[PDB]
């Protein structure tokens, strides 16, 4: 099954990626890195989230609407895997890519809150420095930034942790084991998918959003009330 | 010449097109807008512009313009497309670009 | 407003004739170097361009059959004919600049697509437009 | 502002080899040179000369809609600054030529917010132009001087009408 | 045109920088261009003369020295002359449009009976050529060669729908590539090598354009012709096929992209190498017999340059190119 | 300018301006922008009172 | 109607952890911004040093 | 007549200074500056010609 | 660690270790370990570099032999005001502090 | 400013342990060269030798060595132009499929461990018929089957 999939992988690779990665994935001098040994997971992350192709050299690549569908993504990943392998996709017990089954070490049918606690402390330890407390993203040096984690599915999160896309450090499966990674996924999805008890969240950016809101519009409405109650002379 | 399709098959999206629309725009806008400024400066200000500086401005713009853009017809014909950022030494149109550039700095 | 009401009939009829000619042409001429078939972009534009000019012309004519022999149109009018009030004109107003800034804020909001910027931009925009439209009718200070 | 970008383009094309620009910077340069020179210089200078001269030629005191004219000026400048804000982006401004052909302008094939800022800067400019035009028709139709029939107008205001 | 230009230095001046051209319709376009330039020069000089007359003859100081007075004749209307001068450009553009239609129609007609048809794919940022069909005269087998690859094209047709189901664009997947033709004899352009398509002399040839990505254009300056390559050309109602009656002389000719496609738009060159008709049979039999061999090896088998002599690949480093040596040494 | 320089981490992340550029905007702006503010504010105030006299 | 300082998702304090957006309250952002824009001028005098934050 | 001679002559060497430098340096960044020197020389040439044009045919008669 | 990777490590005396082959299920070492985590000035960033990037390292005078192959170990506490630095850019190889952008 | 000739996205290399040698102008490139040493003690050299000699001078990997010590490898076909010889330890080599379309070939490797340390770097010397290539490579464990392993306390 994979042997014929690799052919479509090659056909798609020849028509898009050579200009940056070479016919033999060796890379190009300043135009793109070598893809030997990156594996299925890096290709899946890069193509499925739509980061590749990169049509402009920049401080950082951008997520966008993907140029290929799922089957084409797996075909290109199979072709790249044939050149040296690498980290692999997390296949579930039936053979499909794992989605919604990575939400915690002890997932049954709903997010276990103990996993959420451990994953919250893990995310605060490692991930929250570049992203923020709830994964709303953050800034870096010279025009680079850490994206907001609301866009990615669970497989993309796992392969992001595994591969270290551009400036993200790698988190191998022996630094952060599968239980730790799945608890991190559980915490990310819990924070994403739970409404704030205290009303509208103001984006959860912290003091900046709350400040801007009050110190512009909250005081503006009260001076409007004062003008209603007072006089202009 | 650009209006006829059989000539446009070669001319389209080349430096010939660049020279054409710079001729029409730089003529109709820049030359005539400067004409309008000099014409209505009295009515717009109550003062008259310096005549000598005006003639200096005109001759500089005229010679710099024709130097810049008349020669780009030839690079357009020879095969240089528009919007090209870099070109080879063996292509054969480096001298024409150099002549264009000096008079472009004169336009500036 | 007689001459300008009626001179608009040339452009609109020319555009309408070009629209019908073009629709028949592209739907029938199977010329090489091109593909047969009606194109809707362009034809729709031509018919609604004829529509714009026809709307202008017909409204102007429908109005002009009402108005009198204005002195500006009378070929031998005297300067004393138009003596009187010409009309009301705004002396000054800060609100055009304000609502330009409001539209700018809204446009920047849709650039980055921060939803709060879009909402605040629309609110600020209708506020500035309202302040523009009520400028010469705000009540006197109520004691 | 646009002509400076034009001179940078010429300086880069003085000799083969990329001396001081990249491919991306060159693309952004010609895109923004074309956009600003056509939409921020040409059409605004047209409407500026129209606004000054046309009421004097048709013998009117003021344009038909003064505040709309001021709105047109300010919104055109707003569109200009929005269009030019793309350069403050780390990735630079739009890079798809002043025509913005598709699919190159698709979300797939043109990420980065500069590509979006072009769209708004052009649009804000466009409505500024429209707001200027509403006056010039209504002015000629309604504020002409006594004795100035339509065919005693100067040729300039005829062209502005069309 | 059927009538040749004036020739000589006048023809060179009227050329005015066009390549001579290597096809019949290239000759036609060149002739039409030369005579149109003659007429344009006539108009240009015969109006620059009137402006010069204004500069030197109609000056105010001359007429005031002559005693003409403070003002001229104050003429405004000369209706018969105005109507004549209006009728003149009408006839000029009319008679021009007649020959325009003539030359255009003999250029664009798709009835030239190709012996060779090459499918061409444009992608960001290089060219991929594939021989689609070859007449039995030039084909290896005696019978007509058909180059469509069954398995790889079957993958293309299978890409149309159902990647577990998205199908947004009129019921097809947004990443459809069924419009691309995949052939078994292909030349693939790279940043390390300029692709070279090998063609014979004196045969009607056909080009079938398409684009994996944003719109490109195929421009051979020696054809004096260029055509846009689009993704889904049928969906765009764009004619993706064009035919040349023949090529008339052998040689290597650069061909460029003439449509703004992206960052590396300038780096997207290719070469069109026209070879003796007897050698083309050797080339195609060599490529067919041992497909693992590269394009350069086949060109060596002919006995000509393994790499594009017209243009060398650009240097791919963004710092080394500052000193103007932006050319890669192919060998 | 002090406030938004304090919040520039969020500002650069959201509005996509380089973080170094934000720090240098704060630095050079704390000199330059006050001068521009003074100039514009002074002239606008004089214009306001001129309208009053008019 | 608006959440403010949602502490439950920040976790308890420990000196080894930090977030990208970790500014103080709004009324303190000015004194944060000062620390962001100071160009790192630090004095060393033998056995003593005046840090750059003085 | 007038300054036009000297303003031309001053330019004629500067232009000569430019093009010479252009044919000295290879394809480099300094070739850009050579082009600028050459164009400055050309500008001063035309500046001399334009003051000559004003002197030949004055149109602001009274100083 | 893989190449171009980071991990925060704390001082762990041999006495308060209850993992691996020595793991006793009934030894309560959690309090001291957490008491070591919460030390103000003892979190250090252990960084594994790529081989290509370990070539172009410049060593400080006196700190010649501190590394162990690809592994370097810097203090996580910023030298300006003491926020954890913690933003290790894997390609630019710049450790970044989020508090004031050192 | 970030889209200049010096750009952050352009200078990047792959996020892999393997070093690499060779420019775009060099005849034969080695990508992803690494010394693997599984937890079970077995070891070898992972790499990928890509041929791009424009002279079409097909080579054959004569030998590879780590610190001068031999590494076993057999059945290495010649590498003609635009072909890749992928080499890895047998257990890891079994995880990926050999492609029937394309020029790639898979080859197994193994070396006796002289006592190399995880984390450190050791020279690797390739010699092909046309010359020798030297490159320093790190020592590390192979990648786990992703998702299967949990942090175990004891
Ligand atoms: C959160 C809860 C906060 C609760 C505490 C504050 C309560 C404030 C209550 C409002 C108040 O004080 O009004 C009087 C107070 C002052 O009135 P004033 O000085 O006594 O009277 C003279 C007018 O202000 C002179 O201005 P004007 O009225 O001639 O023109 C401005 C126009 C502005 O009106 C609008 O913008 C609304 C336009 C119609 C939109 C229709 C669709 C809405 C859906 O009207 C108003 O501002 C008054 C209506 C405000 C509500 C409109 C909604 O109004 C304001 O200051 C409103 C200005 C800003 C309005 C933004 C919307
Ligand atoms: C949908 C989008 C458009 C929404 C606005 C619709 C405009 C037409 C409405 C009907 C109309 O002509 O009313 C005049 C009518 C008569 O006013 P008037 O003061 O007696 O007029 C004679 C002036 O004194 C004559 O003295 P003046 O010249 O000083 O006053 C001129 C005055 C009145 O002008 C006129 O009456 C004639 C000209 C009509 C407006 C033409 C410009 C429209 C905007 C630019 C071009 C279109 C861009 C889209 O101009 C305006 O009111 C300007 C309106 C600006 C709209 C800005 C839209 C920004 C979109 C950003 C994207 O208006 C009113 O009294 C009622 C309020 C008007 C509409 C309020 C809009 C609500 C907020 C919606 C904003 C979007 C959210
Ligand atoms: C202010 C700005 C512009 C003006 C004015 C202008 C005038 C013309 N243009 Fe144009 N132009 C084209 C054709 C014409 C024609 C027929 C006229 C007319 O106004 C010319 C009439 C003007 C005259 C001054 C006539 C001569 C005067 C006299 C008194 C003799 C009467 C004529 C006779 C007797 C017939 C001539 C006789 C012969 C024997 C030849 C075409 C295609 O037919 C293209 C697209 C080509 C392509 O492939 O992209 C084009 C491209 C452009 C672009 C492309 C921008 C882009 O691609 O991004 C711009 C900005 C531009 C601006 C302007 N253009 N033009
Ligand atoms: C109204 C319409 C236009 C005007 C006027 C115009 C003027 C020039 N153009 Fe152009 N342009 C080109 C060269 C020039 C040059 C050298 C000038 C000259 O007029 C420029 C000199 C004039 C200046 C005016 C600049 C001097 C500035 C100075 C000396 C000082 C700056 C500093 C300060 C502080 C300024 C003072 C500031 C104050 C506030 C007082 C070239 C090639 O040499 C291309 C094609 C390149 C390619 O590969 O695609 C091109 C492309 C275009 C395109 C197509 C863009 C596209 O395909 O996307 C359009 C529509 C266009 C329009 C226009 N262009 N031009
Ligand atoms: C604003 C546009 C100027 C700007 O951003 O200038 C930054 C430094 O701030 C400034 O001067 C801001 C000046 C504000 C003036 C007052 C208003 C430095 O650029 P940076 O952000 O580090 O981007 C890197 C390139 O510098 C570097 O060449 C390139 O190779 C890349 O590394 C690129 O990422
Ligand atoms: C640069 C080199 C050329 C400088 C101009 C030299 C010619 C000159 O001085 O012309 C003067 C002329 C004004 O007219 P007038 O005084 O009548 O002179 C012509 C009859 N003696 O000047 C003019 O008429 C100039 C009018 C513009 C000509 C533009 C041609 C294109
Ligand atoms: C009743 C009223 C609602 C308004 C928006 C709230 C913020 C928000 O949506 O945030 C999430 C939102 C995130 O996007 P979203 O979730 O997609 O809407 O924030 C942003 O995008 C904007 C970020 C703003 C950064 C501000 C930096 C600091 C500014 C300090 C200004 C100080 C002024 C001092 C003035 C003194 C004199 C008075
Ligand atoms: C009010 C802020 C005063 C900062 C003085 C820094 C002196 C210093 O630590 O200066 C030391 C530093 C070295 O000096 C420099 O950078 C030279 C420039 C110092 C500031 C000149 C203004
Ligand atoms: C700064 C050094 C980072 C740390 C620490 C972590 N990540 Fe990150 N991450 C970072 C960057 C610069 C990027 C963008 C990469 C790119 O090529 O665009 C990312 C991206 C992600 C993503 C993808 C988000 C998306 O929208 O596709 C995810 C899911 C992600 N990062 C997760 C993540 C986790 C869980 C981390 C802790 C284990 C973590 N990252 C650390 C920078 C940094
Ligand atoms: C240039 C025109 C590109 C094309 C086409 C494709 N990619 Fe790319 N890729 C490019 C750059 C400049 C970079 C480095 C910047 C970055 O975002 O990392 C990359 C990187 C990758 C990677 C990451 C490798 C890693 O070690 O993590 C992968 C996996 C990758 N590219 C794959 C890929 C594929 C499969 C493509 C065609 C389907 C493709 N890219 C297109 C530039 C370009
Ligand atoms: S605490 Fe690190 S820069 Fe201030
Ligand atoms: Cu292209
Ligand atoms: Cu292109
Ligand atoms: Ca150059």
Curated annotation (Swiss-Prot), chain A:
Reaction catalysed by this enzyme: a quinol + 2 Fe(III)-[cytochrome c](out) = a quinone + 2 Fe(II)-[cytochrome c](out) + 2 H(+)(out)
Binding site for heme c 1: 17, 20-21
EC number: 7.1.1.8
Domain Cytochrome c per the UniProt entry, residue ranges: 4-84, 114-192
Record membrane topology: Multi-pass membrane protein
Main location per the UniProt record: membrane
UniProt: heme c 2 binding residues: 127, 130-131
UniProt subcellular location: Cell membrane
Post-translational modification: Binds 2 heme c groups covalently per subunit.
GO MF term (any one): ubiquinol-cytochrome-c reductase activity
Keywords assigned: Cell membrane, Electron transport, Heme, Iron, Membrane, Metal-binding, Repeat, Respiratory chain, Translocase, Transmembrane, Transmembrane helix, Transport
Effect of loss of the gene: Cells lacking qcrCAB show strongly impaired growth in glucose minimal medium, which indicates that the bc1-aa3 pathway is the main route of respiration under these conditions.
Assigned GO CC terms: plasma membrane
Residue ranges crossing the lipid bilayer per the database entry: 211-231
Note: No stable monoheme protein can accumulate if the incorporation of the other heme group is blocked; assembly of both the cytochrome bc1 complex and the cytochrome bc1-aa3 supercomplex depends on heme assembly.
Subunit structure: The cytochrome bc1 complex is composed of a cytochrome b (QcrB), the Rieske iron-sulfur protein (QcrA) and a diheme cytochrome c (QcrC) subunit. The bc1 complex forms a supercomplex with cytochrome c oxidase (cytochrome aa3).
Protein name: Cytochrome bc1 complex cytochrome c subunit
Species lineage: Bacteria, Bacillati, Actinomycetota, Actinomycetes, Mycobacteriales
Portion held of the full protein: 51 to 283 of 283
Curated annotation (Swiss-Prot), chain E:
Region of interest: Disordered: 140-175, 307-331
Listed transmembrane segments: 36-56, 79-99
PROSITE patterns: COX2, COX2_CUA, COX2_TM
Keywords: Cell membrane, Copper, Electron transport, Lipoprotein, Membrane, Metal-binding, Respiratory chain, Signal, Translocase, Transmembrane, Transmembrane helix, Transport
Compartments it resides in: Cell membrane
Positions of Cu cation A1 binding: 216, 257, 261, 268
Catalysed conversion reaction: 4 Fe(II)-[cytochrome c] + O2 + 8 H(+)(in) = 4 Fe(III)-[cytochrome c] + 2 H2O + 4 H(+)(out)
Binding site for Cu cation A2: 257, 259, 261, 265
Membrane topology category: Multi-pass membrane protein
One matching Pfam family: COX2
Chief site of localization: membrane
Lipidation (S-diacylglycerol cysteine): 1
Site (Not N-palmitoylated): 1
Binding partners and assembly: Associates with subunits I, III and IV to form cytochrome c oxidase. The 4 subunit cytochrome c oxidase forms a supercomplex with the menaquinol-cytochrome c reductase complex (cytochrome bc1).
PANTHER family in alphabetical order: CYTOCHROME C OXIDASE SUBUNIT 2 (PTHR22888:SF9), CYTOCHROME C OXIDASE, SUBUNIT II (PTHR22888)
Protein name stated in the entry: Cytochrome c oxidase subunit 2
UniProtKB/Swiss-Prot annotation, chain G:
Compartments where located: Cell membrane
Knockout or disruption consequences: Cells lacking qcrCAB show strongly impaired growth in glucose minimal medium, which indicates that the bc1-aa3 pathway is the main route of respiration under these conditions.
Family per record: Belongs to the cytochrome b family.
Function: Cytochrome b subunit of the cytochrome bc1 complex, an essential component of the respiratory electron transport chain required for ATP synthesis. The bc1 complex catalyzes the oxidation of menaquinol and the reduction of cytochrome c in the respiratory chain. The bc1 complex operates through a Q-cycle mechanism that couples electron transfer to generation of the proton gradient that drives ATP synthesis.
Subunit structure: The cytochrome bc1 complex is composed of a cytochrome b (QcrB), the Rieske iron-sulfur protein (QcrA) and a diheme cytochrome c (QcrC) subunit. The bc1 complex forms a supercomplex with cytochrome c oxidase (cytochrome aa3).
Annotated protein name in UniProt: Cytochrome bc1 complex cytochrome b subunit
Organism, as annotated: Corynebacterium glutamicum (strain ATCC 13032 / DSM 20300 / JCM 1318 / BCRC 11384 / CCUG 27702 / LMG 3730 / NBRC 12168 / NCIMB 10025 / NRRL B-2784 / 534)
The encoding gene: qcrB
Location of this fragment in the whole protein: 271 to 324 of 539
From Swiss-Prot, chain I:
Disruption phenotype: Cells lacking qcrCAB show strongly impaired growth in glucose minimal medium, which indicates that the bc1-aa3 pathway is the main route of respiration under these conditions.
Record domain Rieske: where: 38-102
Compartments (UniProt record): Cell membrane
Signal peptide segment: none
Binding site for [2Fe-2S] cluster: 78, 80, 97, 100
Disulphide-bridged cysteine pairs: 83-99
Domain of life where this protein originates: Bacteria
Function: Iron-sulfur subunit of the cytochrome bc1 complex, an essential component of the respiratory electron transport chain required for ATP synthesis. The bc1 complex catalyzes the oxidation of menaquinol and the reduction of cytochrome c in the respiratory chain. The bc1 complex operates through a Q-cycle mechanism that couples electron transfer to generation of the proton gradient that drives ATP synthesis.
Stated family: Belongs to the Rieske iron-sulfur protein family.
Assembly information from the UniProt record: The cytochrome bc1 complex is composed of a cytochrome b (QcrB), the Rieske iron-sulfur protein (QcrA) and a diheme cytochrome c (QcrC) subunit. The bc1 complex forms a supercomplex with cytochrome c oxidase (cytochrome aa3).
Protein name in UniProt: Cytochrome bc1 complex Rieske iron-sulfur subunit
Boundaries of the shown chain within the full protein: 256 to 357 of 408
């Amino acid at each position: 099954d994979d042997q014929a999939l690799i052919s479509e992988g090659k056909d798609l690779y020849d028509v898009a990626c050579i200009t940056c990665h070479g016919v033999n994935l060796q890379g190009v001098e300043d135009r793109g890195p070598s893809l030997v040994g990156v594996g299925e997971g890096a290709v899946y992350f890069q193509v499925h989230s739509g980061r590749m192709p990169i049509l402009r050299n920049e401080a950082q690549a951008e997520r966008k609407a993907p140029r290929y569908t799922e089957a084409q993504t797996l075909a290109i990943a199979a072709y790249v895997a044939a050149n040296g392998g690498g980290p692999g996709l997390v296949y579930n017990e039936d053979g499909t890519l794992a989605m919604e089954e990575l939400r915690g070490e002890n997932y049954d049918g709903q997010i276990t809150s103990a996993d959420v606690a451990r994953g919250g402390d893990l995310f605060r330890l490692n991930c929250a420095s570049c992203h923020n407390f709830t994964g709303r993203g953050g800034a870096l040096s010279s025009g680079k930034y850490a994206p907001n984690l609301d866009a990615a599915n669970e497989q993309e999160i796992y392969q992001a942790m595994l591969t270290g896309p551009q400036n993200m450090p790698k988190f191998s499966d022996r630094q952060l084991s599968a239980d730790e990674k799945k608890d991190i996924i559980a915490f990310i999805k819990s924070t994403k998918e739970t409404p704030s008890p205290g009303g509208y969240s103001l984006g959860s950016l912290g003091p900046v959003a709350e400040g801007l809101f009050m110190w512009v519009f909250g005081i503006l409405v009260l001076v409007a009330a004062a003008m209603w109650i007072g006089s202009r002379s | 010449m650009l209006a006829s399709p059989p000539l446009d098959f070669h001319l389209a999206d080349s430096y010939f097109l660049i020279a054409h629309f710079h001729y029409t725009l730089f003529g109709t806008v820049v030359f005539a807008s400067c004409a309008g400024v000099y014409f209505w400066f009295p009515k717009m200000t109550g003062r008259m512009m310096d005549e000598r500086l005006g003639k200096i401005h005109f001759w500089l713009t005229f010679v710099g313009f024709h130097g810049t853009f008349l020669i780009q017809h030839w690079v357009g014909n020879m095969g240089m497309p528009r919007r090209y950022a870099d070109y080879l030494d063996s292509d054969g149109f480096t001298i024409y670009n150099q002549i264009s550039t000096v008079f472009s700095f004169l336009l500036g | 407003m007689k001459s300008s009401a009626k001179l608009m009939y040339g452009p609109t009829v020319f555009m309408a004739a070009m629209a019908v000619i073009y629709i028949f042409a592209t739907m029938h001429v199977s010329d090489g170097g091109s593909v047969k078939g009606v194109e809707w972009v362009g034809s729709v534009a031509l018919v609604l361009s004829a529509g714009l000019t026809l709307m202008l012309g017909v409204y102007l004519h429908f109005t002009e059959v009402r108005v009198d022999v204005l002195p500006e149109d009378w070929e031998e009018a005297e300067v004393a004919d138009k003596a009187g009030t010409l009309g009301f004109f705004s002396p000054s107003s800060i609100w055009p600049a304000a609502m330009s800034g409001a539209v700018g804020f809204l446009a920047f909001g849709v650039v980055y697509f921060h939803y709060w910027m879009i909402a605040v931009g629309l609110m600020l925009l209708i506020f500035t437009i309202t302040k523009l439209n009520l400028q010469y009718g705000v009540p006197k200070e109520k004691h | 502002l646009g002509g400076l970008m034009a001179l940078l383009i010429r300086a880069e094309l003085f000799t083969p080899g990329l001396q001081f620009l990249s491919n991306e910077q060159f693309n952004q340069l010609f895109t923004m040179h074309g956009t600003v020179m056509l939409l921020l210089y040409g059409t605004p200078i047209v409407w500026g000369f129209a606004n000054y001269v046309l009421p004097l030629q048709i013998g009117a005191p003021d344009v038909a809609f003064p505040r709309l004219n001021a709105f047109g000026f300010w919104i055109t400048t707003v569109g200009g600054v929005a269009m030019l804000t793309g350069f403050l982006t780390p990735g630079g401004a739009a890079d798809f030529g002043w025509t913005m052909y598709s699919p190159l302008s698709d979300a797939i094939h043109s990420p980065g917010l500069g590509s979006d800022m072009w769209i708004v800067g052009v649009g804000a400019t466009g409505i500024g132009s429209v707001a200027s035009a509403i006056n010039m028709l209504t002015t000629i139709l309604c504020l002409r001087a006594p004795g100035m029939t339509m065919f005693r107008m100067p040729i300039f205001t005829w062209n502005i009408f069309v | 045109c059927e009538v040749a230009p004036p020739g000589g230095v006048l023809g060179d001046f009227l050329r005015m920088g066009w390549p001579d051209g290597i096809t019949p319709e290239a000759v036609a376009m060149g002739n039409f261009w030369s005579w149109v330039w003659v007429a344009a020069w006539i108009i240009g000089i015969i109006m620059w003369g009137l402006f010069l007359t204004a500069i030197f003859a109609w000056g105010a100081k001359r007429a005031e020295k002559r005693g003409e007075g403070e003002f001229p004749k104050q003429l405004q209307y000369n209706v018969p002359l105005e109507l004549v001068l209006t009728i003149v450009p009408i006839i000029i553009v009319m008679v021009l449009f007649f020959f325009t239609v003539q030359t255009q129609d003999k250029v664009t007609a798709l009835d030239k009976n190709p012996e060779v048809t090459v499918d061409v794919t444009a992608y960001q940022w290089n060219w991929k050529f594939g021989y689609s069909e070859i007449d039995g005269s030039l084909a290896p087998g005696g019978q007509d060669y058909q180059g469509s690859d069954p398995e790889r094209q079957a993958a293309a047709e299978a890409s149309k729908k159902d990647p577990s189901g998205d199908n947004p664009i009129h019921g097809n997947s947004k990443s459809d590539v069924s419009y691309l033709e995949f052939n078994r004899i292909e030349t693939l352009g790279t940043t390390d090598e300029i692709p070279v398509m090998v063609l014979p002399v004196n045969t009607p040839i056909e080009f079938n354009l398409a684009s994996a990505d944003v719109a490109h254009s195929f421009w051979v300056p020696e054809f004096l012709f260029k055509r846009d390559a689009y993704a889904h050309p049928e969906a765009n109602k764009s004619q993706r096929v064009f035919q040349i009656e023949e090529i008339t002389e052998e040689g290597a000719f650069v061909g460029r992209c003439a449509e703004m496609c992206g960052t590396y738009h300038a780096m997207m060159n290719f070469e069109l190498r026209v070879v003796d008709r007897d050698s083309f049979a050797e080339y195609i039999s060599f490529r067919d017999s041992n497909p693992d061999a590269t394009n350069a090896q086949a060109l060596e088998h002919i006995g000509q340059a393994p790499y594009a002599t017209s243009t060398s690949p650009f240097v791919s480093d963004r710092t080394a190119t500052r000193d103007g040596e932006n050319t890669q040494s192919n060998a | 300018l002090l406030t938004v320089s304090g919040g520039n981490d969020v500002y650069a992340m959201q509005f996509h301006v380089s973080l170094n550029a934000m720090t240098w905007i704060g630095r050079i702006g704390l000199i330059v922008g006050p001068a521009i503010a003074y100039f514009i504010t002074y002239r606008l105030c004089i214009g306001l009172q001129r309208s009053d006299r008019e | 109607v608006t959440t403010i300082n949602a502490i439950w998702n920040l976790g308890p304090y420990n000196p080894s952890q930090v977030s990208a957006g970790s500014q103080p309250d709004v009324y303190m952002l000015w004194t944060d911004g000062a620390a962001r824009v100071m160009p790192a001028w630090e004095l060393y005098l033998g056995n003593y040093t005046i840090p750059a934050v003085f | 007549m007038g300054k036009s001679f000297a303003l031309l002559v001053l330019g004629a060497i500067i232009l000569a200074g430019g093009v010479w430098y252009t044919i000295e340096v290879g394809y480099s960044v300094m070739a850009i500056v050579a082009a600028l020197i050459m164009a400055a020389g050309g500008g001063i040439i035309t500046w001399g010609l334009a003051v000559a044009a004003d002197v030949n045919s004055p149109t602001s008669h009274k100083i | 660690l893989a190449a171009a990777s980071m991990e925060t490590v704390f001082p762990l005396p041999a006495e308060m270790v209850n993992d691996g082959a020595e793991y006793d299920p009934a030894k309560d070492v959690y309090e001291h370990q957490m008491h070591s985590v919460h030390g103000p000035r003892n979190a250090v960033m252990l960084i594994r570099l790529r081989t290509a990037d370990a070539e172009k390292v410049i060593e400080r005078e006196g700190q010649e032999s501190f590394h162990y192959g690809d592994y370097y170990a810097y203090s996580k506490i910023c030298t300006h005001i003491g926020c954890p630095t913690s933003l290790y850019e894997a390609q630019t190889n710049r450790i970044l502090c989020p508090c004031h952008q050192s | 400013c970030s889209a200049g000739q010096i750009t952050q996205t352009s200078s990047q290399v792959a996020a892999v342990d393997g070093n690499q040698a060779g420019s775009a102008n060099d005849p034969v490139l080695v990508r992803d060269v690494t010394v693997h040493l599984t937890t079970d003690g077995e070891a070898g050299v992972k790499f990928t030798a890509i041929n791009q000699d424009t002279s079409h001078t097909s080579h054959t990997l004569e030998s590879v060595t780590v610190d001068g010590e031999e590494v076993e490898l057999d059945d290495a076909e010649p590498i003609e132009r635009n072909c890749s010889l992928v080499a890895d330890i047998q257990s890891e080599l079994d995880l990926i499929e050999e492609p029937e379309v394309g020029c790639i070939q898979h080859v197994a490797t193994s070396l006796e461990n002289p006592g190399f340390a995880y984390g450190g770097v050791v020279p690797v010397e390739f010699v092909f018929d046309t010359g020798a290539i030297t490159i320093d490579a790190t020592v590390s464990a192979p990648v786990l089957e992703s998702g299967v392993e949990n942090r175990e306390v004891g």
